Paper text:
TERB1 is a molecular scaffold that simultaneously interacts with TERB2 and shelterin subunit TRF1. Knockout of any components of the TERB1–TERB2–MAJIN (TTM) complex impairs the telomere–NE attachment and results in infertility in both male and female mice. To reveal the structural basis for the interactions between TERB1 and TERB2 and between TERB2 and MAJIN, we crystallized the TERB1587–659–TERB22–116 and the TERB2119–220–MAJIN2–149 complexes and determined their structures using single-wavelength anomalous dispersion (SAD) method at resolutions of 3.3 and 2.9 Å, respectively.
Our data revealed that a short fragment of TERB2 at the C-terminus (residues 168–202) is sufficient for interaction with MAJIN. In the TERB2MBM-MAJINNTD complex, MAJINNTD adopts a compact fold with a curved four-stranded β sheet (β1–β2–β3–β5) holding helix α1 in the center. The highly hydrophobic TERB2MBM polypeptide meanders along a hydrophobic groove on the surface of MAJINNTD and buries a total of ∼1300 Å2 surface area at the interface. The C-terminus of TERB2MBM and the loop between strands β3 and β5 of MAJINNTD contact each other and fold into an intermolecular anti-parallel β sheet that packs onto the central β sheet of MAJINNTD to further strengthen the interaction. It is worthy of noticing that, although there are three TERB2MBM–MAJINNTD complexes in one asymmetric unit in the crystal structure, two protomer complexes apparently form a heterotetramer with an extensive hydrophobic dimeric interface between two MAJINNTD molecules. In particular, located at the center of this interface, the side chain of Phe192 of TERB2 is buried in a pocket formed by a group of hydrophobic residues of both MAJIN and TERB2. Again consistent with the crystal structure, substitution of Phe192TERB2 with a negatively charged bulk arginine residue completely abolished the TERB2–MAJIN interaction in 293T cells.
Numbering used by the authors:
A (entry chain A): 1 to 32, 39 to 109
B (entry chain D): 174 to 209
Write the structure that this text describes.
């Protein structure tokens, strides 16, 4: 169902094309089964942030607590993104998702 | 005390792709002030 799988243990930076926009996502996992269940869960996490851009709060998934954060994207004017001929519009904020286990 | 369930969080329901430059027609460009 989902798009590309995640580095589970380690930090990663993911660019995402959604509507006419490019989102910069950074994922961090703290003190930490079935690959695509986790993929779908982190994707669901992204979609949630993407649907609450100005209304960020920590949430609980099946396995995790996601604390999304939003920082200015420094030097975005320096970058152009294209999908073939189509200009993609950068959302000029970095989303950092800090993912902990619920326990 | 307790965090909101993802189930109660509204979410973006659209097509969503990894922007991977050099893939699926995707290209990224960095401003320069020198040329070669």
């Amino acid at each position: 169902s989902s798009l590309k799988p995640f580095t589970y243990p380690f930090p990663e930076t993911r660019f995402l094309h959604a509507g006419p926009n490019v989102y910069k996502f950074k994922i961090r996992y703290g003190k930490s089964e079935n690959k695509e269940v986790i993929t779908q869960e982190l994707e669901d996490s992204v979609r949630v942030v993407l649907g609450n851009l100005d209304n960020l709060q920590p949430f609980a998934t099946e396995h995790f607590i996601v604390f999304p954060y939003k920082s200015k994207w420094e030097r975005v004017s320096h970058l152009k993104f294209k999908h073939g001929e189509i200009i993609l519009i950068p959302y000029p904020f970095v989303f950092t998702l800090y993912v902990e286990m619920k326990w | 005390t307790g965090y909101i369930s993802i189930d109660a969080m509204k979410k973006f329901l659209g097509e969503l792709h990894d922007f991977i430059p050099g893939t699926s027609g995707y290209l990224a460009y960095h401003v320069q002030n020198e040329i070669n």
